[PDB]
Enzyme design. Structure first.
Site, PDB file in Angstrom:
ATOM      1  CG  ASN A  46      -1.830  -1.220   1.212  1.00 43.19           C
ATOM      2  OD1 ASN A  46      -1.856  -1.992   2.172  1.00 43.19           O
ATOM      3  ND2 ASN A  46      -2.440  -1.468   0.077  1.00 43.19           N
ATOM      4  CG  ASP A  48      -0.788   2.893   4.379  1.00 40.34           C
ATOM      5  OD1 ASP A  48      -0.221   1.927   3.923  1.00 40.34           O
ATOM      6  OD2 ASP A  48      -1.888   2.817   5.077  1.00 40.34           O
ATOM      7  CG  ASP A  52      -3.634  -5.010   2.536  1.00 38.05           C
ATOM      8  OD1 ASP A  52      -3.632  -4.413   3.591  1.00 38.05           O
ATOM      9  OD2 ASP A  52      -4.239  -4.581   1.465  1.00 38.05           O
ATOM     10  CG  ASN A  59      -3.254  -2.448   6.488  1.00 40.01           C
ATOM     11  OD1 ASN A  59      -2.999  -1.611   7.353  1.00 40.01           O
ATOM     12  ND2 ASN A  59      -2.755  -2.399   5.267  1.00 40.01           N
TER      13      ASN A  59
END
Length: 129
Positions: A46, A48, A52, A59
């Site tokens: 991801n 950020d 996952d 996450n």
């Protein structure tokens, strides 16, 4: 490990997901299908900085610790690596924590977009019989 539909259904049933927090079994099967394609090894990066992990794409920002995600909370209290096992126990136990702690199954994007609103019971159709 790639599970089969009914094979996963049975395993999830054993682990007590059927109707857990009000979500019938088909919900969980459908989620795994669209999240990971039933693959225990799936991982997704991801923007950020989080990733996952596994069959239920749990996450690393909130749930498990992967030692490389900034702002890690580890609410499941497990290393993300455990979620990549061919045995789904860790994933299921953490999934129960997720759903019990808030937004229910909304934590799963694929669930919300592709499962919710459809006849999810169809996902466990023909499995016992």
């Amino acid at each position: 490990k790639v599970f089969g539909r009914c094979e996963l259904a049975a395993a999830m049933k054993r682990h007590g997901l059927d109707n857990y927090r009000g979500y019938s079994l088909g919900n969980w099967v459908c989620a795994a299908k669209f999240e990971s394609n039933f693959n225990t090894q799936a991982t997704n990066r991801n923007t950020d900085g989080s990733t996952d992990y596994g069959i239920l794409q749990i996450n690393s920002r909130w749930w498990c610790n992967d030692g490389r995600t900034p702002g890690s909370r580890n609410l499941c209290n497990i290393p993300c690596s455990a979620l990549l096992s061919s045995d789904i126990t860790a994933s299921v136990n953490c999934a129960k924590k997720i759903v019990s702690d808030g937004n229910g199954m909304n934590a799963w994007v694929a669930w919300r977009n592709r499962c919710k609103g459809t006849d999810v019971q169809a996902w466990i159709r023909g499995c016992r019989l």
